[PDB]
Amino acid sequence: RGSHMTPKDDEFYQQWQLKYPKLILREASSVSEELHKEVQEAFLTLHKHGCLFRDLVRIQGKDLLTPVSRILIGNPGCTYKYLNTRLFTVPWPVKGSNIKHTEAEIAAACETFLKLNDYLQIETIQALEELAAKEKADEVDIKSRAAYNVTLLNFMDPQKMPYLKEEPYFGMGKMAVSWHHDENLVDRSAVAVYSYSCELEGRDPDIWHVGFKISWDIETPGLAIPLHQGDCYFMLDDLNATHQHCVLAGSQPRFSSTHRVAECSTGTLDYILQRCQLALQNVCDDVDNDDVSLKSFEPAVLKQGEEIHNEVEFEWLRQFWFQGNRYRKCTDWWCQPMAQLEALWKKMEGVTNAVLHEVKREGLPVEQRNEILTAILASLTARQNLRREWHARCQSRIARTLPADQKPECRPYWEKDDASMPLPFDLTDIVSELRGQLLEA
Ligand SMILES: O=C(O)c1ccnc(C(=O)O)c1
Ligand SMILES: [Zn+2]
């Protein structure tokens, strides 16, 4: 049978030392009391303002509201995509920055989680240095695998959330968060967790734990680590890759701050603006109007264009507004940036329209035409499929169930009669005709 260990078992510590040596635990005692005060107050203040939300996530074709509710705080302009959902940071006061976008208390709370972020980073570097020293018995690889750019805050009150699946392999009881890896992190990057609980026969049901197992493996007993108020733990190096973890609910409300190094090479505002500019290079930009005319109709430039159009629409606008407008509750940092990405995308609807006009044109040899179609067709079919997916996802029986405060908005969205927009929202007819054309004979 499947079993787990806790500090109650003699094997616990040796199983820890032998098969989870990259799991580190620093009890509340190792953390200054003033930091405990500022951090716990910050949690409570964010909860009081209604800043944490359950996400209407997606999993294997199903829309599911997270039991846990969350907020993501970190570097400005930075995102973190988990479960096909792109969380946008409410910014913290990282250097050379200013946020008139957040509220006094909320801004102070992000300040605090910045302080906590710095603290944990220092501990993580210390621990990775110790780890390397044991082994063999770069400095910059360590620096970068501890360089937390975000933190995902969690809240769950099990008493007002009586809907928890049981741990299915080791009898660890009730799961606030089931077995998973933390995804979309920088390779071998550490993860640090601050745990704030509002304080026989296996683990204690009343007390929050984090569960650990080896991937693919349910014969090796799992480890259930008890978490008391202010305990921190670190997942080092490849632990998050080779092991899975879950969060086992106790009986009392609990917050957590999960600091991570998000892989954001295609996940920052700067990055997505730069891609937009790149696409608009193919556009004569003397003036902003509806007479969009393109500098080139070379396949490669058109393919790239339609790809960037898809990127900004679906990984950026539809993601942001699917949660909308709940960010506005904590900050307005993303208000202008999202307006601007919407205007760039509008232009791109324009570009696509120039391309269609060009393919449906008199003096154009069918060879060049077919070149263009093969270059853009994949992108338009993906655009249609992803629009159906987002519209439907915006209308799930469960989507239309949570507060208007966070009802998904399907945006951008326009009716067939919408004269401001050059192309229909529904691309079915267009894609049909293009396919037909490429098959003539
Ligand atoms: O609540 C936690 O301690 C925790 C730990 C690790 N991961 C998550 C998560 O939500 O991914 C939450
Ligand atoms: Zn996790």
**What are the distances in angstroms from CA 268 to CA 254, 263, 264, 271, 325?**
30, 10, 6, 5, 19
CB atoms within 10 A of CB 380: 21
Strand 209-214 versus strand 222-226 pairing type: antiparallel
Which ligand is closest to the CA of 82, given by its number? 1
- Joined together, the tokens standing for residue 165 give 């699946």
Cα(104)–Cα(106) distance, rounded to whole angstroms? Answer: 6
Length of the chain: 441
- Joined together, the tokens standing for residue 282 give 């193919």
Distance 123 CA to ligand 2 centre (A): 19
In the annotated binding site for Fe cation, the residues are 180, 182, 245
Distance 62 CA to ligand 1 centre (A): 21
- Joined together, the tokens standing for residue 273 give 């603006």
Q: Return the beta strands (E) in 268-387 as ranges.
A: none
SS3 60: coil
DSSP class of 362: S
Phi then psi for residue 256, to 5 deg, are -145, 150
Phi then psi for residue 23, to 5 deg, are -105, 120
The resolution of the experimental structure, rounded to one decimal in Å, is 2.5
Q: Return the beta strands (E) in 20-89 as ranges.
A: 23-26, 56-59, 62-65, 69-74, 79-82, 85-88
In the annotated binding site, the residues are 70, 82, 154, 180-183, 233, 245, 254-256, 258, 260
DSSP string, 206-233: TS-EEEEEETT-SSSPEEEEE--TT-EE
Q: What amino acid is encoded at 387 in this protein?
A: R
- Ligand 1 lined by 151 (C-beta under 6 Å): no
Cα(134)–Cα(126) distance, rounded to whole angstroms? Answer: 13
Cα(384)–Cα(71) distance, rounded to whole angstroms? Answer: 31
Cα(154)–Cα(177) distance, rounded to whole angstroms? Answer: 10
Q: At what angle do helices 366-395 and 299-311 cross, to 10 degrees?
A: 10
Cα(5)–Cα(19) distance, rounded to whole angstroms? Answer: 13
DSSP class of 68: S
- With 0-12 / 13-18 / 19 or more C-beta atoms within 10 angstroms meaning exposed / middle / buried, residue 332 is middle
Any bridge partners for residue 71, and if so which? 153
Counting runs of H as helices and runs of E as strands, what totals does the chain give? Answer: 12, 16
3-state helix, strand, coil in the chain (%, to 5): 40, 20, 40
Looking from the CA of 203 toward its CB, the CA atoms found within 13 Å total 30
Nearest CA to ligand 1 atom 11: 182
Cα(108)–Cα(16) distance, rounded to whole angstroms? Answer: 38
Instruction: Decide: 184 and 81 in contact? Cβ < 8 Å.
Output: yes
Experimental method: X-ray
Phi then psi for residue 124, to 5 deg, are -75, -40
SS3 326: coil
Domain boundaries, the chain: 4-268, 269-402
CATH architecture of 4-268: Sandwich (2.60)
Instruction: Decide: 221 and 168 in contact? Cβ < 8 Å.
Output: no
What CATH homologous superfamily does 269-402 map to? FTO C-terminal domain (1.20.58.1470)
DSSP class of 406: S
Helix H or strand E encompassing 191 = strand 191-197
Cα(384)–Cα(306) distance, rounded to whole angstroms? Answer: 12
- Joined together, the tokens standing for residue 209 give 């734990």
DSSP class of 28: G
